[PDB]
């Protein structure tokens, strides 16, 4: 068959593109997300996959979803992504604990799961540009206060045919977060601290992406913008791979036989990680339940329990900051599927979220919604969970992982479900060491660097390269600009 998988915008039934086009374009001009309109046929033979390398599972899954790329293009992307940047050749090892399995997604460059897709996105982009006969360098603009900034920089660093400029809020990040970015190496990477309202920074990036005069200047200088934000399909599809890999590891170790259903509990922010597990189920992965774990910012928990998405609520900075959200960006893709892949109806709900601050899901596919469960954990519950898993399993979870393991305990209690369950472990405790060390030791008032040293003494786990010697690493980025000067600084840097 010569058919390719059609990606459509969730807000325009006529905006259809191939996988390579969706990745290079990133954002749909209509405001929607590029989303697969059908699910590809994938032969999940665990008799073979139980012995497959991570890269072999990636080739099977990525071939199915990114089907306008050749086998040789995908091999190039997989081999360049899943290399020595990872601190174990397993890439995403599954660890067996007393009452759960933890899928460790923190073995990449920045010890956080966003490395899984950001290690490969740059190669998808440069390969897509060449496939479309473009001779332009791709310029990524990223405005974020989360771990995405460091993961994006580390993924694009020294990738030929790419340049990345990351904007972060000055005094809006921890000292350990700031140093991770300002010590980042790579001549094609630049990090700029923004003085002022950081909402303006995000607005200014969108303005630049839609600026027709600026686009003409980039074209003339053999440049083009792309986006590596939460809604790029190239950041979601590589996440499908590790759900299939986790299942393969359960079969390989004799924990399950192929065909048995497993559950996945996912610490959720913008929803792409748990949506990737949903896409894994759609291509045949035996999934019993997808458990959406939230922190005190529980708009998603309220949505799954009432079908009302209401963003008019207090916002809290928590100990699981990557999940501090009001608008879960990728939930829109699930809304689209819940409505039978209907862009008009999806647009209506998204327009209601913007004008009314809320929407209610009605006339949806119950088979899809019934796959999801949801609970949230408080900050105290997060700390109590890091302490309990340390006591029971001699294993230290980061706070995001602990929100998920605490939510799994709540899910088990409320439903009595005994299905084997995998926790998606989204960061190393070395990335958020203060809450982890204080939770297991009872200590208080530790600095980030004091907690790093104590975590090594307590766990016996080697300090990952991302935070090893970070206190004395050379500062390569020392730029702070006002939000209103971002575009002039970008134009001057690009020689426009
Ligand atoms: C980004 C992030 C999350 C949330 O992931 P989504 O796919 O956006 O739901 C959770 N934990 C950590 C550590 C993260 O960096
Ligand atoms: Cl610069
Ligand atoms: Na590389
Ligand atoms: Na069993
Ligand atoms: Na299948």
Coordinates of C-alpha atoms and ligand atoms in Angstrom, one line a residue:
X1 CA 0.0 0.0 0.0
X2 CA 1.3 3.5 -0.8
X3 CA -1.0 5.3 1.7
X4 CA 0.7 7.5 4.3
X5 CA -0.7 8.3 7.7
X6 CA -2.6 11.6 7.5
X7 CA -2.0 14.1 10.3
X8 CA -4.8 16.6 10.6
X9 CA -5.1 19.8 12.7
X10 CA -7.6 19.3 15.7
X11 CA -9.1 22.6 14.5
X12 CA -9.2 22.3 10.7
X13 CA -10.3 19.1 8.9
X14 CA -8.8 20.5 5.6
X15 CA -5.3 21.1 7.2
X16 CA -3.8 17.6 6.4
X17 CA 0.0 16.9 6.3
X18 CA 2.4 14.0 6.4
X19 CA 4.5 13.2 9.5
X20 CA 7.6 15.0 8.2
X21 CA 5.5 18.1 7.4
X22 CA 3.8 18.1 10.9
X23 CA 7.2 17.9 12.6
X24 CA 8.8 20.7 10.6
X25 CA 5.7 23.0 10.8
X26 CA 5.3 22.2 14.5
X27 CA 2.2 24.3 15.1
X28 CA -1.0 24.5 12.9
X29 CA -1.7 28.1 11.8
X30 CA -5.4 27.5 12.8
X31 CA -4.3 27.1 16.4
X32 CA -4.9 23.3 16.5
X33 CA -2.5 20.3 16.9
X34 CA -1.3 18.0 14.1
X35 CA -2.9 14.6 15.1
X36 CA -3.0 11.2 13.4
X37 CA -6.5 10.8 11.8
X38 CA -6.1 6.9 11.9
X39 CA -3.9 4.5 13.7
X40 CA -1.2 2.6 11.7
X41 CA -1.1 -1.2 11.6
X42 CA 1.8 -2.4 13.9
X43 CA 2.7 -6.1 14.4
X44 CA 3.5 -6.2 18.2
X45 CA 5.1 -9.7 18.4
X46 CA 6.5 -9.9 22.0
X47 CA 8.1 -13.2 21.3
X48 CA 10.5 -11.1 19.2
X49 CA 10.2 -7.7 21.0
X50 CA 11.1 -9.2 24.4
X51 CA 14.7 -9.6 23.0
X52 CA 14.7 -6.3 21.0
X53 CA 17.1 -3.4 21.7
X54 CA 15.4 0.0 22.5
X55 CA 16.5 1.2 19.0
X56 CA 14.8 -1.9 17.4
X57 CA 11.5 -1.1 19.2
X58 CA 11.9 2.6 18.1
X59 CA 12.3 1.5 14.5
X60 CA 9.1 -0.6 14.6
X61 CA 7.0 2.1 16.3
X62 CA 8.5 5.1 14.4
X63 CA 8.2 3.4 11.0
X64 CA 4.4 3.0 11.6
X65 CA 3.7 6.6 12.7
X66 CA 6.4 8.6 10.8
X67 CA 5.7 6.7 7.6
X68 CA 6.8 9.3 5.0
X69 CA 10.4 8.9 6.3
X70 CA 12.4 6.1 4.7
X71 CA 13.9 3.2 6.7
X72 CA 17.4 4.7 6.2
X73 CA 16.2 8.1 7.4
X74 CA 14.7 6.6 10.6
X75 CA 17.8 4.5 11.3
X76 CA 19.9 7.7 11.0
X77 CA 17.6 9.5 13.5
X78 CA 17.4 6.6 15.9
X79 CA 21.2 5.9 15.9
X80 CA 22.0 9.7 16.4
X81 CA 19.4 10.1 19.2
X82 CA 19.8 6.9 21.4
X83 CA 23.6 7.0 21.6
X84 CA 26.2 7.8 24.4
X85 CA 24.0 10.7 25.5
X86 CA 22.2 7.9 27.5
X87 CA 24.0 6.6 30.6
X88 CA 22.8 3.0 30.1
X89 CA 22.5 1.1 26.8
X90 CA 19.1 -0.1 28.0
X91 CA 18.0 3.6 27.5
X92 CA 14.7 3.1 29.5
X93 CA 15.2 0.3 32.1
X94 CA 12.1 -1.1 34.0
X95 CA 12.8 -1.6 37.7
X96 CA 10.7 -4.1 39.7
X97 CA 9.6 -2.7 43.2
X98 CA 7.5 -4.5 45.8
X99 CA 4.0 -3.4 44.5
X100 CA 4.8 -1.6 41.2
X101 CA 7.3 -1.4 38.3
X102 CA 9.1 1.9 37.6
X103 CA 10.0 2.8 34.0
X104 CA 13.2 4.9 34.4
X105 CA 13.0 7.7 31.7
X106 CA 15.8 9.8 33.3
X107 CA 18.9 8.2 31.7
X108 CA 19.3 10.9 29.0
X109 CA 21.4 14.0 28.9
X110 CA 19.2 16.1 31.3
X111 CA 18.0 13.2 33.6
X112 CA 14.3 14.0 32.7
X113 CA 12.0 12.1 30.3
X114 CA 11.7 15.0 27.8
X115 CA 15.1 13.8 26.6
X116 CA 13.4 10.8 25.1
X117 CA 11.9 12.8 22.3
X118 CA 14.1 15.9 22.3
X119 CA 17.2 13.7 21.6
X120 CA 15.6 12.6 18.2
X121 CA 13.4 15.6 17.2
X122 CA 16.4 17.6 15.8
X123 CA 17.2 14.8 13.4
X124 CA 13.6 14.4 12.4
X125 CA 13.6 18.1 11.5
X126 CA 16.8 18.3 9.5
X127 CA 15.9 15.1 7.7
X128 CA 12.4 16.5 6.9
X129 CA 13.9 19.8 5.7
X130 CA 16.2 17.9 3.2
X131 CA 13.3 15.6 2.1
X132 CA 11.3 18.7 1.2
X133 CA 14.2 20.2 -0.8
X134 CA 14.8 23.0 1.8
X135 CA 18.3 24.3 2.1
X136 CA 17.5 26.3 5.3
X137 CA 19.0 26.1 8.8
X138 CA 16.1 25.5 11.3
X139 CA 15.9 28.1 14.1
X140 CA 14.0 26.9 17.3
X141 CA 12.6 29.5 19.6
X142 CA 11.6 28.1 23.1
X143 CA 10.2 30.3 26.0
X144 CA 9.8 28.1 29.1
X145 CA 10.2 28.2 33.0
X146 CA 10.4 24.3 33.2
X147 CA 12.9 21.5 32.5
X148 CA 12.0 21.8 28.8
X149 CA 14.6 24.6 28.3
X150 CA 17.6 22.4 29.4
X151 CA 16.2 19.3 27.6
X152 CA 15.7 21.2 24.3
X153 CA 19.1 22.8 24.5
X154 CA 20.8 19.4 25.2
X155 CA 18.8 17.7 22.4
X156 CA 19.7 20.3 19.7
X157 CA 23.3 21.0 20.9
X158 CA 25.7 20.6 18.0
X159 CA 23.0 19.1 15.7
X160 CA 24.0 20.3 12.2
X161 CA 21.4 22.4 10.4
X162 CA 19.8 23.7 13.6
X163 CA 20.0 26.6 16.0
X164 CA 18.1 26.9 19.3
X165 CA 17.4 30.1 21.4
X166 CA 15.8 29.4 24.8
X167 CA 14.2 32.2 26.9
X168 CA 13.6 31.6 30.6
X169 CA 12.3 34.0 33.4
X170 CA 15.1 35.7 35.3
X171 CA 14.8 34.8 39.0
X172 CA 11.9 32.5 37.9
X173 CA 14.0 29.3 38.2
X174 CA 16.0 27.5 40.9
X175 CA 19.8 28.0 41.0
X176 CA 20.4 24.3 39.9
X177 CA 17.9 24.9 36.9
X178 CA 19.6 28.2 36.0
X179 CA 23.2 26.6 36.1
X180 CA 22.0 23.6 34.0
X181 CA 21.2 26.0 31.2
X182 CA 23.9 28.7 31.6
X183 CA 26.7 26.0 31.5
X184 CA 25.2 24.2 28.5
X185 CA 27.8 23.7 25.7
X186 CA 27.1 23.9 21.9
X187 CA 27.8 26.9 19.6
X188 CA 24.3 26.5 18.1
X189 CA 22.6 26.9 21.5
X190 CA 21.8 30.2 23.3
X191 CA 19.9 30.9 26.6
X192 CA 18.5 34.3 27.4
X193 CA 17.1 35.3 30.8
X194 CA 13.9 37.6 30.4
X195 CA 13.4 40.5 32.8
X196 CA 9.7 41.3 33.2
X197 CA 6.3 39.5 32.7
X198 CA 7.2 36.0 31.2
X199 CA 3.7 35.8 29.6
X200 CA 5.0 38.5 27.2
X201 CA 8.0 36.3 26.3
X202 CA 5.6 33.5 25.2
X203 CA 3.5 36.0 23.3
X204 CA 6.6 37.5 21.6
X205 CA 7.7 34.0 20.4
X206 CA 4.3 33.4 18.9
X207 CA 4.4 36.9 17.3
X208 CA 7.8 36.1 15.7
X209 CA 6.5 32.8 14.3
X210 CA 3.5 34.6 12.6
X211 CA 5.5 37.7 11.5
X212 CA 5.4 37.7 7.6
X213 CA 8.1 40.4 7.2
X214 CA 10.4 38.5 9.6
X215 CA 9.7 35.2 7.7
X216 CA 10.8 36.9 4.4
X217 CA 14.1 37.9 6.1
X218 CA 14.8 34.4 7.4
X219 CA 14.0 32.9 3.9
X220 CA 16.5 35.3 2.3
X221 CA 19.2 34.3 4.8
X222 CA 18.4 30.5 4.3
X223 CA 16.7 30.2 7.7
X224 CA 13.3 29.1 8.9
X225 CA 11.6 28.9 12.3
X226 CA 10.3 25.8 13.8
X227 CA 8.8 25.0 17.3
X228 CA 9.9 22.3 19.8
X229 CA 7.0 23.0 22.2
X230 CA 4.7 20.5 23.9
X231 CA 2.4 20.3 20.8
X232 CA 5.0 19.2 18.2
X233 CA 3.9 15.7 17.1
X234 CA 7.7 14.9 16.9
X235 CA 7.9 15.2 20.7
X236 CA 4.9 12.9 21.2
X237 CA 5.4 9.9 18.8
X238 CA 8.9 8.9 20.2
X239 CA 7.1 8.6 23.6
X240 CA 4.9 5.7 22.3
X241 CA 8.1 3.6 21.9
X242 CA 8.9 3.3 25.6
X243 CA 5.4 2.0 26.6
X244 CA 5.9 -0.9 24.1
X245 CA 9.5 -1.3 25.5
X246 CA 8.2 -1.5 29.1
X247 CA 5.7 -4.2 28.1
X248 CA 8.5 -6.1 26.3
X249 CA 10.7 -6.0 29.5
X250 CA 7.8 -7.4 31.6
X251 CA 7.5 -10.3 29.0
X252 CA 11.3 -10.8 28.9
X253 CA 11.6 -11.0 32.7
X254 CA 8.6 -13.4 33.0
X255 CA 6.5 -10.9 35.0
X256 CA 3.7 -11.3 32.5
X257 CA 2.9 -13.4 29.4
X258 CA 2.1 -11.5 26.2
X259 CA -1.6 -10.6 26.1
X260 CA -1.9 -9.8 29.8
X261 CA -3.1 -6.2 30.3
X262 CA -1.0 -3.8 32.3
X263 CA -1.7 -0.3 33.6
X264 CA 0.4 2.8 33.3
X265 CA 0.4 5.6 35.9
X266 CA 1.8 8.8 34.4
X267 CA 2.8 12.0 36.2
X268 CA 0.9 14.4 33.9
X269 CA 1.3 18.1 32.9
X270 CA 0.6 18.8 29.2
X271 CA -0.7 15.2 28.6
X272 CA 1.7 14.1 25.8
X273 CA 3.2 11.3 27.9
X274 CA -0.1 9.7 28.8
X275 CA -1.5 10.4 25.3
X276 CA 1.5 8.4 23.9
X277 CA 0.5 5.5 26.1
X278 CA -3.1 5.8 24.6
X279 CA -1.6 5.7 21.1
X280 CA 0.4 2.6 22.2
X281 CA -2.9 1.0 23.2
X282 CA -4.4 2.0 19.8
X283 CA -1.7 0.0 17.9
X284 CA -2.3 -3.1 20.0
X285 CA -0.4 -2.7 23.3
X286 CA -2.4 -4.6 26.1
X287 CA -3.3 -1.6 28.3
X288 CA -6.0 -2.0 31.1
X289 CA -6.0 1.5 32.4
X290 CA -4.2 4.8 32.0
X291 CA -4.0 6.6 35.4
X292 CA -3.5 10.4 35.1
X293 CA -1.5 11.6 38.2
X294 CA -1.8 15.3 39.1
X295 CA -0.3 17.5 41.9
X296 CA -2.3 20.2 43.8
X297 CA -2.9 21.8 40.3
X298 CA -5.7 19.2 39.7
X299 CA -7.6 20.6 36.7
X300 CA -7.2 17.2 35.0
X301 CA -8.4 15.3 38.0
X302 CA -11.6 17.5 38.1
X303 CA -12.0 16.9 34.3
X304 CA -11.9 13.1 34.5
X305 CA -14.2 13.1 37.6
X306 CA -16.8 15.6 36.2
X307 CA -16.2 16.0 32.4
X308 CA -15.9 19.8 33.1
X309 CA -12.5 21.4 32.2
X310 CA -12.3 24.6 34.3
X311 CA -9.1 26.7 34.2
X312 CA -10.6 29.4 36.5
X313 CA -8.8 28.2 39.7
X314 CA -5.9 29.1 42.0
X315 CA -2.4 28.3 40.6
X316 CA 0.2 26.8 43.0
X317 CA 4.0 26.4 42.5
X318 CA 4.7 22.9 43.9
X319 CA 7.5 20.4 44.6
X320 CA 6.5 18.6 41.3
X321 CA 6.8 21.8 39.2
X322 CA 6.8 20.2 35.8
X323 CA 3.2 19.4 36.4
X324 CA 2.1 22.9 37.6
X325 CA -0.4 23.5 34.7
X326 CA -3.8 25.2 34.1
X327 CA -4.1 24.3 30.4
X328 CA -2.9 20.8 29.6
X329 CA -1.9 21.4 25.9
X330 CA -2.2 17.8 24.6
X331 CA -5.6 17.1 26.2
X332 CA -7.0 18.8 23.1
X333 CA -5.8 15.7 21.0
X334 CA -7.7 13.4 23.3
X335 CA -10.8 15.7 23.1
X336 CA -10.6 15.4 19.3
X337 CA -10.5 11.6 19.5
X338 CA -13.3 11.6 22.1
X339 CA -15.5 13.5 19.6
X340 CA -14.8 11.1 16.8
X341 CA -12.0 13.1 15.2
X342 CA -14.3 16.1 14.8
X343 CA -12.4 19.4 14.3
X344 CA -15.5 21.6 14.3
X345 CA -16.7 20.3 17.7
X346 CA -13.1 20.4 19.1
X347 CA -12.7 24.0 18.0
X348 CA -16.0 24.9 19.7
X349 CA -14.8 23.5 23.1
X350 CA -11.4 25.2 22.8
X351 CA -13.0 28.5 21.9
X352 CA -15.2 28.0 25.0
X353 CA -12.2 27.4 27.2
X354 CA -10.8 30.7 26.0
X355 CA -14.0 32.8 26.2
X356 CA -15.7 31.2 29.3
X357 CA -12.7 29.7 31.1
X358 CA -14.3 26.2 31.0
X359 CA -16.1 23.6 28.8
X360 CA -18.0 20.4 29.4
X361 CA -17.4 17.2 27.4
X362 CA -20.8 15.7 26.1
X363 CA -21.6 13.2 23.3
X364 CA -18.2 11.5 23.5
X365 CA -16.8 8.0 22.9
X366 CA -17.2 6.3 26.3
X367 CA -14.8 3.4 25.2
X368 CA -12.0 6.0 25.0
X369 CA -12.9 7.9 28.2
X370 CA -13.4 4.7 30.3
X371 CA -9.7 3.8 29.7
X372 CA -8.7 6.8 31.9
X373 CA -8.6 7.1 35.7
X374 CA -7.3 10.1 37.6
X375 CA -6.2 11.2 41.1
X376 CA -4.0 14.0 42.6
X377 CA -1.5 14.1 45.4
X378 CA -0.7 17.0 47.8
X379 CA 2.8 18.2 48.5
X380 CA 2.7 16.4 51.9
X381 CA 1.5 13.2 50.2
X382 CA 4.4 13.6 47.7
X383 CA 7.0 13.7 50.5
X384 CA 5.4 10.9 52.4
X385 CA 5.5 8.7 49.3
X386 CA 9.2 9.4 48.6
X387 CA 9.8 8.3 52.2
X388 CA 7.6 5.2 52.0
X389 CA 9.1 3.8 48.8
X390 CA 12.6 4.5 50.3
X391 CA 11.6 2.5 53.4
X392 CA 9.9 -0.4 51.6
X393 CA 12.1 -0.7 48.5
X394 CA 15.4 1.1 49.4
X395 CA 14.6 3.1 46.2
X396 CA 14.4 7.0 46.0
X397 CA 11.8 8.4 43.6
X398 CA 11.9 12.1 42.4
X399 CA 8.8 14.1 43.4
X400 CA 7.0 13.8 39.9
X401 CA 7.5 10.0 40.1
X402 CA 6.2 10.0 43.7
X403 CA 3.0 12.0 42.7
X404 CA 2.4 9.1 40.3
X405 CA 3.2 6.3 42.8
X406 CA 1.0 8.0 45.4
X407 CA -1.8 8.3 42.9
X408 CA -1.4 4.6 42.0
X409 CA -2.0 3.7 45.7
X410 CA -5.1 5.9 45.7
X411 CA -6.3 4.3 42.4
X412 CA -5.8 0.8 43.9
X413 CA -7.6 1.8 47.1
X414 CA -10.6 3.3 45.2
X415 CA -11.0 0.5 42.6
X416 CA -9.5 -2.7 44.0
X417 CA -7.8 -3.2 40.6
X418 CA -4.9 -5.7 41.0
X419 CA -3.7 -5.4 37.3
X420 CA 0.2 -5.1 37.2
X421 CA 1.1 -1.4 36.9
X422 CA 4.1 0.5 35.5
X423 CA 4.9 4.0 36.9
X424 CA 6.4 6.3 34.2
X425 CA 9.3 7.8 36.2
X426 CA 9.9 11.2 34.6
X427 CA 13.0 12.5 36.4
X428 CA 15.9 11.4 38.6
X429 CA 15.8 12.6 42.2
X430 CA 19.1 14.2 41.3
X431 CA 17.1 16.7 39.3
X432 CA 14.9 17.7 42.3
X433 CA 17.2 16.8 45.2
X434 CA 15.9 19.0 48.0
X435 CA 12.4 17.5 48.3
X436 CA 13.8 14.0 47.9
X437 CA 16.6 14.3 50.5
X438 CA 14.4 16.2 53.0
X439 CA 11.6 13.5 52.5
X440 CA 13.9 10.5 53.3
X441 CA 16.2 12.2 56.0
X442 CA 13.8 14.5 57.9
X443 CA 16.3 17.4 57.3
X444 CA 15.0 20.9 56.5
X445 CA 16.4 24.1 54.9
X446 CA 18.9 22.3 52.5
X447 CA 20.2 24.2 49.5
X448 CA 20.1 22.5 46.0
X449 CA 23.9 21.7 46.1
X450 CA 23.7 20.5 49.8
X451 CA 20.9 18.1 48.8
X452 CA 22.9 16.8 45.7
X453 CA 25.9 15.8 47.9
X454 CA 23.7 14.1 50.5
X455 CA 21.6 12.2 47.9
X456 CA 24.9 10.5 46.6
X457 CA 25.9 9.5 50.2
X458 CA 22.3 8.1 50.9
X459 CA 21.5 6.3 47.6
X460 CA 25.0 5.1 46.4
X461 CA 23.7 5.9 42.9
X462 CA 26.4 7.7 40.8
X463 CA 25.8 11.5 40.4
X464 CA 24.6 11.9 36.7
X465 CA 26.7 14.0 34.4
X466 CA 24.0 16.7 34.2
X467 CA 24.5 17.7 37.8
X468 CA 28.0 16.3 38.5
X469 CA 30.4 19.3 39.1
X470 CA 27.6 21.8 38.1
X471 CA 28.6 24.1 41.0
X472 CA 32.0 24.8 39.4
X473 CA 31.2 24.3 35.6
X474 CA 32.1 27.4 33.4
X475 CA 29.2 29.9 32.6
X476 CA 28.8 30.1 28.8
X477 CA 25.5 32.2 28.8
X478 CA 25.2 35.5 30.8
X479 CA 22.5 37.4 28.7
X480 CA 19.4 39.1 30.3
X481 CA 17.1 41.2 28.1
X482 CA 13.7 42.9 28.5
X483 CA 10.8 41.0 26.9
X484 CA 10.2 43.9 24.4
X485 CA 13.8 43.5 23.1
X486 CA 13.6 39.8 22.3
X487 CA 12.8 40.2 18.6
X488 CA 15.6 42.8 18.0
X489 CA 18.1 40.5 19.8
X490 CA 17.0 37.4 17.7
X491 CA 17.2 39.5 14.4
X492 CA 20.7 40.8 15.3
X493 CA 22.0 37.3 16.2
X494 CA 20.6 35.7 13.0
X495 CA 22.1 38.7 10.9
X496 CA 18.7 39.8 9.6
Ligands
LIG1 C1 7.3 17.5 31.5 C2 7.3 16.7 32.7 C3 6.1 16.0 33.2 C4 4.8 16.2 32.4 O1 4.8 15.5 31.1 P1 3.6 15.7 30.0 O2 3.9 14.7 28.9 O3 3.6 17.2 29.7 O4 2.3 15.4 30.8 C5 6.2 15.2 34.3 N1 7.4 15.1 35.0 C6 8.5 15.7 34.6 C7 9.8 15.4 35.3 C8 8.5 16.5 33.4 O5 9.7 17.1 33.0
LIG2 CL1 22.2 35.5 21.9
LIG3 NA1 24.3 14.4 18.1
LIG4 NA1 -0.8 -12.0 36.3
LIG5 NA1 -1.1 -4.1 16.3

